[PDB]
């Protein structure tokens, strides 16, 4: 959802 984090 949030660039891999």
């Amino acid at each position: 959802i949030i660039x891999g984090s």
Epitope: I1, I2, X3, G4
Partner: antibody
Framework: QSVEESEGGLFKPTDTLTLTCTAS????????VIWVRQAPGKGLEWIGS???????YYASWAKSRSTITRNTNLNTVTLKMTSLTAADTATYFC??????????????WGPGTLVTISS | DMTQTPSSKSVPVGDTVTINCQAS????????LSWFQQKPGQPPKLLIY???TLASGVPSRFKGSGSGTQFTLTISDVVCDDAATYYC????????????FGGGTEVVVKG
């Protein structure tokens, strides 16, 4: 340290549009890469994105007939689109994002490649 | 979505122009918002990222602000070189339709 879109050209409605974002002087790995396009007399339109850490995400209009693929051996990101129509005639751009922390701070842009879908 | 008003604006040389961008919902952390400049025949150019931070080489007469879902680009001391279409881009998540482009604001510089 730049990206460039591969050759566009003339495509039939039954063709597959394949465009490659190639890098020179830096790596696309671990960096966001976006595909956008601009039809004549229209605003920029997002197609989809390769996330820095491996997720691929699309505009809903593109998701049903597009695939974006990373190749970390050849240092490219490729856009493949099918079921082509006149609405896909456009300039296609890719861009690289230096810092994941900006999310959409896409700072390295290709020159754009010209695509025409014929009958 | 990002809703950009107006779709076009004319501004005399030396004056200040403002471009508006309303996000349909909050962008991530209320700050994943960039502004781009695109001149016809050229690719977009990054102007501002994270609401207010200038990209390299961009002069400080370009200013970005934001509050809630509202974002504004201000260009002061406008010169003819500022003629372009300006876009905001907002990001919420790395998902389908998770980012959006505004419709653009064409700025015509009046000499």
């Amino acid at each position: 340290q730049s990206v460039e879109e591969s050759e566009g050209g003339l495509f039939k409605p039954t063709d597959t549009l394949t465009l490659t974002c190639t890098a020179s002087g830096f790596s696309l790995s671990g960096h966001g890469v976006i595909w956008v396009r601009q039809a004549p007399g229209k605003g920029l339109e997002w197609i989809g994105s390769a996330g820095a850490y491996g997720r691929i995400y699309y505009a809903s209009w593109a998701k049903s007939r597009s695939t974006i693929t990373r190749n970390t051996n050849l240092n490219t990101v490729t856009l493949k689109m099918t079921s082509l129509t006149a609405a896909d005639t456009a300039t296609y751009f890719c861009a690289r994002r230096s810092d994941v922390g900006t999310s959409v701070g896409f700072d390295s842009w290709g020159p754009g490649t010209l695509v025409t879908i014929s009958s | 979505d990002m809703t950009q008003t107006p779709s076009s604006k004319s501004v005399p040389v030396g004056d200040t122009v403002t471009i508006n961008c309303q996000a349909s919902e909050s962008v991530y952390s209320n700050n994943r918002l960039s502004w781009f400049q695109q001149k016809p025949g050229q690719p977009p150019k990054l102007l501002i990222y994270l609401v207010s931070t200038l990209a390299s080489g961009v002069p400080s007469r370009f200013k970005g602000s934001g509050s809630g879902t509202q974002f504004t680009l201000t260009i002061s001391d406008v010169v003819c070189d500022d003629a372009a279409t300006y876009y905001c881009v907002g990001y919420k998540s790395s998902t389908t339709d998770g980012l959006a482009f505004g419709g653009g604001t064409e700025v015509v510089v009046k000499g």
